[PDB]
Design a binder for this molecule. Structure first.
Ligand SMILES: [K+]
Ligand SMILES: [K+]
Ligand SMILES: [K+]
Ligand SMILES: [Mg+2]
Ligand SMILES: [Mg+2]
Ligand SMILES: [Mg+2]
Ligand SMILES: [Mg+2]
Ligand SMILES: [Mg+2]
Ligand SMILES: [Mg+2]
Ligand SMILES: [Mg+2]
Ligand SMILES: [Mg+2]
Ligand SMILES: [Mg+2]
Ligand SMILES: [Mg+2]
Ligand SMILES: [Mg+2]
Ligand SMILES: [Mg+2]
Lengths: 69, 51, 63, 343, 225, 132
RNA sequence: UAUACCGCCAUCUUCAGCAAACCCUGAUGAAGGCUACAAAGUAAGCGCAAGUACCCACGUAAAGACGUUAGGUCAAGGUGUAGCCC
RNA sequence: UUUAAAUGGUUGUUUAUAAAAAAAUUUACUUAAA
């Protein structure tokens, strides 16, 4: 992230159904996403990461719900 | 809400003094529910009793 | 109490209204005299402005 | 060692750490800020763990007209005394844990619209129990000093009024918030306005005024309309005693300009009597709810003019576009005329 | 039962007469003219608020209208007498150092108070801290000179209005009369003028105090029998 | 800045006694000594044992009369006698004072093997010299 | 863990300022408040000063506020928090 | 008017109320009897 924060935020690059390729933040603690997997993305910018304006939806297609604690 | 917090306040067409509190004395219009805070259920009962 | 807002109204209007409102319990010693024998002008604060343009003082030269 | 034990005052001063570098310049902020407990509170002189009963100290000196001798409470009796002592502590501790319900102002954590109570009585047996005080703004202003750097001060705006026309406001400044409240509250009662209320519920006419960059447009309203104005104006109106009014604040929403502008406009309103006297004509009120009945609200105390006021065919008056635009049904707003709680 | 009668016969009675103390006889327009009361400052020193009181400018020297002076002085002397009759504390204020000794004597002679010295900040608005919690402030303040020694309004004029104390003031052509309750337009420089003001206000106060004693005595003698 | 035994200025609301208001450089100028014995005179012995005894006695009396002492003790030694002069408050009942005087005089006489007297002087409240 | 603190201190200080409580000014903004032939300041308290010690009223000691450097010291002793307990 | 004199890592330096209460001891010998 940009100042004054510090972290390693888990992002992915997806090819959207429109054909454009964009970087999408994966929310939650722990993700099992691999290349060639299908995800549903939504809006909402990650205020830390400049230029990340998409978010992966947890619990749709391959991206599963975060595992309890 | 004001009506549901006191179980002794009965919304009845005969309890005219209670019903009067929920009507404008100067214009005669029944206050809409947000005005007094009564829930929709009690506002509907109050309106019917006033009529 | 009393009102120290000397630029709002006059000492009379302020005293009259506060006694009227019940803030001042007793009228001041001078109030009844002012009411009976008021001044020609009510002493209200005014701001002196300079004259611009064609505004001139009406004072005439004594000849 | 018995010789290394300190007193309670020394032990608490060290443990609390109220004076230190951590508190000088907003350096350390801890929610877990430790609180002092007086450990001598519930202790009785002569009461110990062994449970001895000392005649004349722990227990009465004489019983049945005879001097008591040294005795010791039985094991089970001491257990009860010790258990009761634990219960008493828990109860006392419970009292401190309880939170008293504070009436919130405009917001949960906001100071605006909280009552400060009546102004303090004057030195000469003077009282202001009729007046009520309400905070309008609390600001943390700062200046820079050579020795300490940022010096934090509190600026507080409070209004006071008895609800019967007499209302005022003042600013109070102090390092402590309590001192700022007191100074503002006590100074406001010495700077009171008198507001002319029409029928003791509204203003005599519509007032449009600009104080610096703040614009206030107030409209006279009938009974039952309520206060449909800026939350700060609502607070001031309740202190003045105005029950029905509408006001729109435009331009800068500075609280000091708004308050000073409101009192400037309300103080400079012309009553119906003042109008009749100035014009030498009857002031006749026409009410729609009373049909064509002419209600004379004021008559000229002096002589009544016999010439009718000249009726200008077209009035050369400055109209506010916002008013005209609303009358023509051209003003759509999803935020106007929204249902709100009784004010 | 007796208080209301006492107040009516004593406190309310004088307020029903136009000139109870007969102050009109103390001065005439001729006497004011002979004291040079009409001589104002040069036109370049004129205050805008004094224009209604100026008769004209004679070779760039403002002439004060003594016909208005007479009406204004009548009201000022009447108000002063009624306050002295009511046992009000009268304070004379002046910063003209040519007349400080005269004014301080005049106050002592009529049993009143004078403040001719440097006016310290808060004398009136912070009196309870300066003098004491039970100090009584003046009921009337008479300004023989309304300007301080830098030709600006004496601070007490503003502070008197803050404390709701009525003020009488001699206002020359360079003075600001807006906050003076009973302004009296006149020359405040010439000794003859200042000597007349002092004689007039000292007489009105002395006359009123004696009248209060006479009226009270008659009420008491009659009360017994 | 020096710290030793200096009650520092507050907001003018902290009541201090006469002893607590005077810093250590006044101990022979404006205030006297809280203990008078011969140990510290030139050529005199047993200054150390007198010091330990004084420290114990001040602790003993603080805990034996909890919340009663209104100022510091004045310890006096004349020959074999030890005299403790304490300014106490008027809150504890007189019966409890008499019990504690009889108890402390006896217990301390057996502990330090000398006749000990306790002279109590009661005050309605703490004597305030100034508000710092 | 002195970056939780008491205690005892260094430093500016070979300084003279800190300041409660009021009052007034700036259109009732952060803030500001003196002129002696005086124009809004009054000011408790603290420090300086004065007193006291040493051989004087000199000098030297002592004293030296509020704050500044999260300055020094958990190893004088005490102690908050966390940790160890074959 | 009048020599020269560059530099100083990142983030951290400001808001919600205050405080216990208790309880009494209960006025004047010696003695004895059945
Ligand atoms: K961060
Ligand atoms: K520790
Ligand atoms: K950071
Ligand atoms: Mg988001
Ligand atoms: Mg909340
Ligand atoms: Mg002049
Ligand atoms: Mg040193
Ligand atoms: Mg440190
Ligand atoms: Mg010396
Ligand atoms: Mg030294
Ligand atoms: Mg010194
Ligand atoms: Mg450090
Ligand atoms: Mg270190
Ligand atoms: Mg470089
Ligand atoms: Mg840098």
């Amino acid at each position: 992230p940009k100042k004054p924060n510090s972290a390693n935020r888990k992002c992915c690059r997806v090819r959207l159904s429109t054909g454009r390729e964009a970087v999408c933040f994966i929310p939650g603690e722990g993700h099992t996403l691999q290349e060639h997997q299908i995800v549903l993305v939504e809006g909402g910018r990650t205020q830390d990461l400049p230029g990340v304006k998409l978010t992966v939806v947890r619990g749709k297609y391959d991206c599963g719900h975060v595992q309890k604690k | 809400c004001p009506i549901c917090r006191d179980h002794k306040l009965h919304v009845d067409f005969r309890n005219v003094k209670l019903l009067e509190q929920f009507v404008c004395a100067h214009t005669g219009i029944i206050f809409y529910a947000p005005y007094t805070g009564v829930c929709v259920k009690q506002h509907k009962r109050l309106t019917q009793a006033i009529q | 109490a009393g009102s120290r807002l000397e630029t709002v109204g006059s000492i009379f209007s302020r005293t009259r209204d506060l006694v009227r409102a019940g803030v001042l319990k007793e009228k001041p010693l001078w109030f009844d005299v002012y009411d009976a024998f008021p001044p020609l002008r009510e002493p209200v604060f005014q701001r002196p402005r300079v004259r611009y343009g064609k505004a001139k003082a009406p004072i005439q030269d004594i000849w | 060692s018995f010789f290394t034990k300190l007193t309670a005052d020394e032990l608490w001063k060290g443990a609390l750490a109220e004076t230190g570098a951590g508190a000088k310049k907003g350096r350390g902020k801890r929610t877990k800020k430790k609180k002092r407990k007086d450990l001598n509170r519930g202790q009785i002189i002569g009461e110990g763990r062994y449970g001895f009963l000392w005649p004349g100290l722990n227990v009465p000196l004489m019983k049945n007209g005879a001097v008591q001798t040294i005795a010791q409470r039985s094991k089970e009796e001491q257990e009860k005394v010790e258990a009761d002592m634990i219960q008493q502590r828990e109860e006392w501790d419970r009292k401190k844990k309880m939170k008293v319900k504070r009436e919130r102002g405009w917001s949960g954590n906001s100071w605006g619209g909280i009552s400060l109570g009546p102004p303090d009585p004057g030195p000469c047996g003077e009282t202001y129990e009729d007046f009520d005080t309400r905070i309008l703004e609390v600001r943390n202003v700062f200046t820079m000093t050579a020795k300490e750097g940022r010096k934090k001060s509190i600026r507080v705006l409070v209004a006071v009024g008895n609800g019967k026309g007499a209302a005022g406001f003042s600013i109070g400044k102090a390092t402590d918030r309590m001192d700022a409240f007191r100074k503002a509250k006590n100074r406001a009662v010495h700077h009171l306005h008198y507001i002319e209320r029409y029928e003791d519920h509204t203003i005599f006419h519509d007032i449009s005024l600009r104080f610096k960059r703040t614009h206030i447009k107030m409209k006279k309203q009938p009974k039952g309309y309520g206060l449909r104005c800026h939350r700060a104006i609502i607070t001031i109106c309740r202190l003045i005693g105005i029950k029905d009014m509408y006001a729109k604040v435009s331009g800068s929403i500075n609280m000091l300009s708004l308050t000073q502008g409101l009192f400037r406009g309300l103080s400079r309103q012309e009553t119906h009597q003042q109008l009749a006297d100035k014009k030498g004509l009857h002031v006749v009120e026409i009410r729609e709810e009373c049909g064509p009945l002419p209600i004379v609200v004021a008559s000229p105390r002096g002589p009544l003019r016999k010439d009718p006021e000249p009726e200008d065919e077209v009035p050369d008056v400055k109209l506010d576009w916002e008013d005209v635009k609303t009358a023509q049904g051209m003003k759509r707003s999803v935020w106007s005329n929204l249902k709100r709680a009784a004010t | 039962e007796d208080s209301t009668d006492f107040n009516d016969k004593i406190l309310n009675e004088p307020l029903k007469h136009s000139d109870f103390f007969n102050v009109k006889e103390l001065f005439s327009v001729r006497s004011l003219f002979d004291a040079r009361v009409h001589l104002g400052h040069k036109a370049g020193c004129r205050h805008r608020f004094m224009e209604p009181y100026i008769f004209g400018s004679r070779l760039d020297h403002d002439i004060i209208d003594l016909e208005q002076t007479a009406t204004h002085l009548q009201l000022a002397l009447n108000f002063t007498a009624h306050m002295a009759y009511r046992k009000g504390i009268i304070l004379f204020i002046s910063r003209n150092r040519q007349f400080s000794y005269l004014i301080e004597n005049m106050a002592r002679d009529c049993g009143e108070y004078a403040h001719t010295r440097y006016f310290r900040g808060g004398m009136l608005t912070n009196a309870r801290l300066l003098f004491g919690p039970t100090v009584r402030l003046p009921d009337l303040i008479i300004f023989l000179h309304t300007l301080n020694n830098i030709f600006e309004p004496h601070v007490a004029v503003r502070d008197a209005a803050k404390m709701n104390i009525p003020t009488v003031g001699i206002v020359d052509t360079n003075c600001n009369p807006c906050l003076i309750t009973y302004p009296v337009p006149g020359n405040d420089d010439s000794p003859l003028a200042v000597h007349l003001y002092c004689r007039l206000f000292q007489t009105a106060i002395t006359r009123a105090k004696e009248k209060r004693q006479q009226v009270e005595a008659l009420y008491r003698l009659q009360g017994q029998k | 800045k020096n710290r030793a035994a200096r009650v520092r200025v507050s907001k003018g609301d902290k009541p201090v006694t006469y002893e607590e208001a005077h810093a250590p450089h006044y101990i022979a100028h404006r205030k006297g000594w809280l203990s008078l014995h011969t140990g510290n005179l030139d050529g005199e012995d047993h200054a150390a044992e007198r010091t330990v005894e004084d420290v114990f006695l001040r602790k003993f009396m603080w805990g034996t009369f909890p919340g009663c002492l209104a100022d510091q003790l004045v310890l006096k030694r004349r020959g074999n006698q030890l005299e403790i002069c304490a300014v106490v408050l008027r809150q504890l009942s007189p019966h409890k004072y008499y019990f504690l005087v009889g108890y402390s005089e006896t217990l301390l006489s057996y502990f330090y093997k000398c006749p000990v007297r306790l002279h109590l002087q009661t005050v309605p409240s703490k004597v305030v010299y100034k508000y710092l």
